[PDB]
Structure formats: C-alpha cells, structure tokens
C-alpha cells in the first residue's frame, strides 16, 4: 500500500 495521511505522510 501507499502511505498517506493516516500513516503520518503528506
């Protein structure tokens, strides 16, 4: 999976 907001990334 991609990392996004919920995984602390922007």
């Amino acid at each position, epitope marked *: *999976k*991609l*990392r*996004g*907001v*919920l*995984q*602390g*990334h*922007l």
Partner: antibody
Framework: QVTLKESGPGILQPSQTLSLTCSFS??????????VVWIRQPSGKGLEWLLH???????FYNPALKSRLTISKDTYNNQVFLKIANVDTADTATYYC??????????????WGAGTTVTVSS | DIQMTQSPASLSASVGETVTITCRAS??????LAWYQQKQGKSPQLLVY???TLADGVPSRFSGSGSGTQYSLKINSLQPEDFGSYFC?????????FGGGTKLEIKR
C-alpha cells in the same frame, strides 16, 4: 552534511513547559519528502515517537501526548521548535531530533542528532 | 494501537555466529519497518528500511525479511562492531511505535 543539533534547558521543574530547539543544516524544510521528527528515550529504556512536522507544514502527534505538544518550523533559519506543556517526572529522557525522509512508498530517519538530556524534577 | 513486539530482549553471541532478531506487529504494516542500531551511549543509526532495504554504509552480512506482521533482522557472521542494541520501528498508521529493543551481548 545533513546535521541536526538539539538545544534545551537541561533541567526543569514539574508542571513547567519544556522548550526544545532543533537546528539543522544540509537539507531544507522547503523540499518535499523532508521532515523533522522528535524521539525520546529514557536512560536504559526503549524509544518513543513523539511527533513530526513536514516540509508542507503537516503535523502529526502521539495521541497520548498530543494535548501537551506544540511544534513549529522556521524554514529560513533551519530550526524546528518543540514545546511540551506541563512536564511530570516521566518526561525525563534523552530527546532526539532527526531528519524524516517520507514518501508514498518509504519512511525512515536516516540522520539523527546526538541527542540532548532532559531532567524533570523539583 | 499498532504495537511492535521485539524478541529476544537479550541475546548472547560470539563473533562469527549468525543470529536473527524478530519483530512482530500487532497488525499488518505492509513492509514499512525500519531497523536501527544503537551503540552504548550513542544516537541510533539506520540499518534497514522497508523491511529489507539496507541503508547506506551497511554491509551485506545484515539482511531484513518478512511481511504482514512478521519481520526479522538477520546478521551473518557477527563482527565486534555489531555488539550493541537493535530496535525495529514501523512507519504505517500513527502512532509510530518502536520495538522494545534487543541487546546483542558477548558470550563468555
């Protein structure tokens, strides 16, 4: 020449506000995929993620501490400012800032500061 | 929340030995696991990211492996500089969480 250096008060009495500064060079907080993270480690114990601030001013917090946490960045002077409000004795630890490299397909702290020691007591 | 369970807490070994440290996440983390190495009294350095990608400066006798919730760090033929502490850490759902650490210590 990516470098980071924590600064702080060293000793603090309980109920006070801990102010920590991270001064960095060799990278910019105006470049994407970059962030600064704070991590702490009580002497002889494990590591704990506190929070991070990103190049685009995104901020993320440990929920256990999020109520007491504040972070900002001064991108022109290459500094990140951390505040922990109302410290108790359990906030006694070594504090690290480190560069966060973050993308949609990876994450890691590849360069850390040497750490700064913080003691909370009366 | 998403917890890292690292074992063993302590491991005695000899130079030349091959050892393996394990880390279990309480939920799928999609290979987003870093390993850090910490010398006594020092700031931790990055060894491995995305579970199996070696960081710069790191010899091939280190390898990572695993998926889902089960990950491990393996050190082939330990060398003196390898003694110290090792921590895993995930980069999936916040809060990010570190393993409790493994002390790699000298057998005698």
């Amino acid at each position: 020449q990516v470098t980071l250096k924590e600064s702080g008060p060293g000793i603090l009495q309980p109920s006070q506000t801990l102010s920590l500064t991270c001064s960095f060079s060799g990278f910019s907080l105006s470049t994407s995929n970059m962030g600064v993270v704070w991590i702490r480690q009580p002497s002889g114990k494990g590591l704990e993620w506190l929070l991070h601030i990103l190049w685009n001013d995104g901020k993320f917090y440990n929920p256990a501490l999020k109520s007491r946490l504040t972070i900002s960045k001064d991108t022109y002077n290459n500094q990140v400012f951390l505040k922990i409000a109302n410290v108790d004795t359990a906030d006694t630890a070594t504090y690290y800032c480190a560069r966060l490299f973050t993308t949609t397909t990876s994450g890691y702290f590849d360069v850390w500061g040497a750490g700064t020691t913080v003691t909370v007591s009366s | 929340d998403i917890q890292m369970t690292q074992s063993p807490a302590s491991l005695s070994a000899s130079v030349g030995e091959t050892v393996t440290i394990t880390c279990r996440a309480s939920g799928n983390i999609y290979n987003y696991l870093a390993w850090y190495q910490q010398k006594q009294g020092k700031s931790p350095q990055l060894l491995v990211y995305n579970a199996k990608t070696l960081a710069d400066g790191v010899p091939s006798r280190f390898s990572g492996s695993g998926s889902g919730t089960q990950y491990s760090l393996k050190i082939n033929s330990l060398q003196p500089e390898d003694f110290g502490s090792y921590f895993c850490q995930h980069f999936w759902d916040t809060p990010w969480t570190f393993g409790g650490g493994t002390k790699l210590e000298i057998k005698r």
